[PDB]
Amino acid sequence: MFVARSIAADHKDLIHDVSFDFHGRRMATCSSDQSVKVWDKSESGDWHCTASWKTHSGSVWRVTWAHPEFGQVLASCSFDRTAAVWEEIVGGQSHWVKRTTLVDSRTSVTDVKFAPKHMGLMLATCSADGIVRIYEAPDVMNLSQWSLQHEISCKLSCSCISWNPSSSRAHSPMIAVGSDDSSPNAMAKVQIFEYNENTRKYAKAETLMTVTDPVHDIAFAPNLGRSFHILAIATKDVRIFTLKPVRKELTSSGGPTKFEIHIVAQFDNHNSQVWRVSWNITGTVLASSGDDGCVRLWKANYMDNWKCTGILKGNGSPV
Amino acid sequence: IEKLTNEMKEAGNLEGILLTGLTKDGVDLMESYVDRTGDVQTASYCMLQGSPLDVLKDERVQYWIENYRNLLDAWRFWHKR
Amino acid sequence: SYIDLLQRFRLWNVSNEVVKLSTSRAVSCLNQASTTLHVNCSHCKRPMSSRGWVCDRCHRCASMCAVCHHVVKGLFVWCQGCSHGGHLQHIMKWLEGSSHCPAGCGHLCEYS
Ligand SMILES: [Zn+2]
Ligand SMILES: [Zn+2]
Ligand SMILES: [Zn+2]
Ligand SMILES: [Zn+2]
C-alpha cells in the first residue's frame, strides 16, 4: 500500500548518508566528495539547499542531528579519525561553524550517535579498533568544551551502535554495539551495556549468542510506553528480537538486570547482505534495505505476526 | 467472573474494561492492549475519565500521557496539545 | 518641548527615535531610568544571569514557550496572574482564539 515519488533534488556526487531533523523539516546529506549539504522544505512543499562545505581530510561516513532543544547541531564522523560538531549561526544567510573536534580515536571513527534528550547532551562514537567513547558537554551554552566521560572496549571491530530511546524512570540507560568481523570462528556479534547507578560505570548485560554472522546495522525501536524493548539486527537476514526485564527481587539490588530474549521475526527475502534498517516514529513499521536494490517495509498483523507490507526498487519503479 | 477477567486481561481485549473497571486490573489490561497495538491516544483519554486518584498516580499512565504529548509536539499540533 | 508635543499627540515611536538620536547628554540619558527587569526561575527561586537562558542551579530551560515548547531567546511576554508566558506572537495569537492560560493552569489571564 506504499507508493513512491522522486524529489527534485540535484546532486553531483554519490550520496552516502541522509538524515532528518526532529520535526521532519530539515535534511542533512553527506556526499562522496567530503561535502555536506542541508536542505529545507518550503511551505509549498519544495526542497531547497541552504548550505554546503567540505569538512574532513578523509571520507565522511555518517552525519546526524541533535535535538532542537539544544539548538541546531550536527555531528559528523569521518574516516580521518575525527568527529566534528557543527552549529548553525545566522546573521539572513545561514553560516554553519565548526565548534569542536574529537580526535581521541586511534582508528577510523566508524559511527557516531546522539544520546536521548532526557539524559542531557551526550554523544557516543564507535571506532574500528573496538572502542566506544561517550562524551558529555557540561554546559549547553558552550559547545566548544567536551569531556570524555566513558570508554568501553569490545575486543571486536565495532561497526554500529544504538541508544535505547526509553525515557521511563525505571529503565537505566542502555547502548547496543554491533560488529562486522568475518572471523571463521563462531563468536558473538552483538553485546549490550547497561549503566549502573551504584557504580557509575557501564557493564555488559546481555550478549546475543544466536548471532554469529557479521552485522552491519542495529536499531532499537521507540519505546512508546511498552513493557519490553524491540531490537532490529541487519545481517544476511533481517532479525527482530524482544527483550523483557525480569522482576528484580527486593532482597538485594545487584548488577545488571536479567533479561529474557525471544526472536519474533526472521526474514530472508533480500537473499543478500541487508545494509540498513530503521524504525518509524511509533515503532510499528520497519524499513530494510539490502544489496538487491530493493526497500522492504514490514509490519505486524491482527495475529501479532510480522509480515511484509511493501516492496520497492532503488530506481523508484514499483514491483 | 474471575476466569473471564483473567482471560480478558491476558489477551488485552478492551471489552474487559466493563469487568475490571478503572483500577490496577484495568491498568494491566490497558498495558496489554498498548503492547498489542501501540495506541496511546485511547489509553490516555480513557484513563482520565473520573479515575480514582491512586490510578492517576501510577507510573505507566503518566508515561503514556507524556508519550502522547511528545507525539503531538512532533507533528506541530501545538494548539491541540 | 518637541518631546512633550509628540507625547501629547501619542506618537511614541517618533518620541523614542528623537530620544535615541539626541545630541544632548540629559535627553539621551532620559530613556535609561529604571527600565531593567529582574527575573528568577520559579523552581529554584534563584535569580538568573543577564546573558543566559539556563538556570545555573536547576540546569533547566526556564524560558520555554508555553505554546511551542521551544527555548525563547528574544522577546518574552509574561502574565502577572499565573506567572506564565512565552513568545510574543504565539501568546497573542493564542489569546485571540481562547481565554485560558495555554499552560493549562485555569487562570483566565484576560478576564472575559
Ligand atoms: Zn531555576
Ligand atoms: Zn512559542
Ligand atoms: Zn497561567
Ligand atoms: Zn495569568
A168/B63 Cβ within 8 A: yes
Task: Please give the backbone phi and psi of residue C50, each rounded to the nearest 5 degrees, phi first.
Answer: -95, -5
Closest alpha carbon within chain B to A165: B67
Q: For residue A249, give Cα distances in angstroms to A240, A256, A279.
A: 29, 13, 33
For residues A286 and A298, the answer to whether their CB atoms sit within 8 Å is yes
Which one-letter DSSP state was computed for residue A117? G
* B26/B19 Cα distance (integer angstroms): 9
At position C28, the amino acid (one-letter code) is S
How does DSSP assign C36-96, residue by residue? ----B-TTT-PBPPSS-SB-TTT-SBTTB-TTT-SB--S--EE-TTTS-EE-HHHHHHHHH
Closest alpha carbon within chain C to A138: C59
The annotation places the binding site of C at 41, 44, 55, 58, 65, 68, 79, 82, 84, 87, 90, 101, 105, 107, 109
Q: Which three cell numbers stand for residue A319?
A: 514491483
Interface contact A140, partner C, CB < 8 A: yes
Residue A4, SS3? coil
Residue that has been written with the C-alpha cell 523552581 in this structure: C43
For residues A235 and A216, the answer to whether their CB atoms sit within 8 Å is yes
Which one-letter DSSP state was computed for residue A237? S
Q: CB under 8 Å to C9, separation ≥6 — which residues?
A: none
Residue that has been written with the C-alpha cell 554546559 in this structure: A139
Residue that has been written with the C-alpha cell 542533512 in this structure: A28
For residues A142 and A191, the answer to whether their CB atoms sit within 8 Å is no
* B62/B64 Cα distance (integer angstroms): 5
Resolution reading in Å: 3.7
Q: How many residues belong to chain B?
A: 81
Selecting from A68, A140, A141 the residue whose C-beta is nearest the C-beta of C70 gives: A68
For residues B40 and B33, the answer to whether their CB atoms sit within 8 Å is no
Task: Please give the backbone phi and psi of residue A44, each rounded to the nearest 5 degrees, phi first.
Answer: -65, -25
B78/C97 Cβ within 8 A: no
> Ligand 3 centroid to C78 CA: how many Å?
10
Residue A172: Cβ within 10 Å count:
16
* A208/B28 Cα distance (integer angstroms): 30
* A308/B32 Cα distance (integer angstroms): 24
Selecting from A23, A223, A228 the residue whose C-beta is nearest the C-beta of B74 gives: A23
For residues A86 and A98, the answer to whether their CB atoms sit within 8 Å is yes
Interface contact A170, partner B, CB < 8 A: yes
Interface of B with A in 55-74 (CB under 8 A): 59-60, 63-64, 66-67, 71, 74
Nearest to A64 by CA among A148, A160, A149: A160
Torsion sign across C-alpha atoms C41, A144, A162, B76: positive
- Report the DSSP beta bridge partners of residue C71: C64
Closest alpha carbon within chain B to A284: B38
For residues A35 and A11, the answer to whether their CB atoms sit within 8 Å is no
Nearest to A78 by CA among A135, A12, A118, A30: A30
Size of interface A-C (CB pairs under 8 A): 8
A141/C53 Cβ within 8 A: yes
Q: In what order do the strands lie in the sheet with A229-234?
A: A217-220, A229-234, A238-245, A259-267
Do β-strands A285-290 and A294-299 pair in parallel, antiparallel, or remain unpaired? antiparallel
Selecting from B38, B67, B74 the residue whose C-beta is nearest the C-beta of A284 gives: B38
The annotation places the binding site of C for Zn(2+) at 41, 44, 55, 58, 65, 68, 79, 82, 84, 87, 90, 101, 105, 107, 109
User: Which of C57, C59, C63, C72 best probes binding to A when mutated, by most A CB atoms within 10 angstroms?
Assistant: C59
Which chains have 3 or more CB–CB distances shorter than 8 Å to chain B? Answer: A, C
Distance from CA of B19 to the nearest CA of A (A): 23
* B7/B12 Cα distance (integer angstroms): 9
For residues A176 and A161, the answer to whether their CB atoms sit within 8 Å is yes
B63/A225 Cβ within 8 A: yes
Torsion sign across C-alpha atoms C90, C94, C95, C100: negative
Nearest to A161 by CA among A192, A135, A137: A192
- How many CA atoms within 13 Å lie on the side-chain side of A118? 13
Q: In what order do the strands lie in the sheet with A60-65?
A: A60-65, A73-78, A83-90, A94-102
Interface contact A32, partner B, CB < 8 A: no
Domain spans, chain A: 1-245+260-319
Task: Please give the backbone phi and psi of residue A255, each rounded to the nearest 5 degrees, phi first.
Answer: -80, -140
Residue A67: Cβ within 10 Å count:
15
A282/B63 Cβ within 8 A: no
For residues C29 and C47, the answer to whether their CB atoms sit within 8 Å is no
* A137/A133 Cα distance (integer angstroms): 13
What distance, in Å, lies between the first and last C-alpha atoms of chain C?
41
> Ligand 1 centroid to C61 CA: how many Å?
8
Q: Which three cell numbers stand for residue C8?
A: 501629547
Which chains have 3 or more CB–CB distances shorter than 8 Å to chain C? Answer: A, B
* A78/B75 Cα distance (integer angstroms): 32
Q: Which three cell numbers stand for residue A148?
A: 570524555
Task: Please give the backbone phi and psi of residue B55, each rounded to the nearest 5 degrees, phi first.
Answer: -65, -45
* A81/A31 Cα distance (integer angstroms): 18
Do β-strands A294-299 and C77-78 pair in parallel, antiparallel, or remain unpaired? unpaired
What distance, in Å, lies between the first and last C-alpha atoms of chain A?
12
C54/A141 Cβ within 8 A: yes
Measured between beta carbons, the chain C residues lying within 8 angstroms of A138 are none
* C50/C38 Cα distance (integer angstroms): 9
Do β-strands A201-208 and A131-136 pair in parallel, antiparallel, or remain unpaired? unpaired
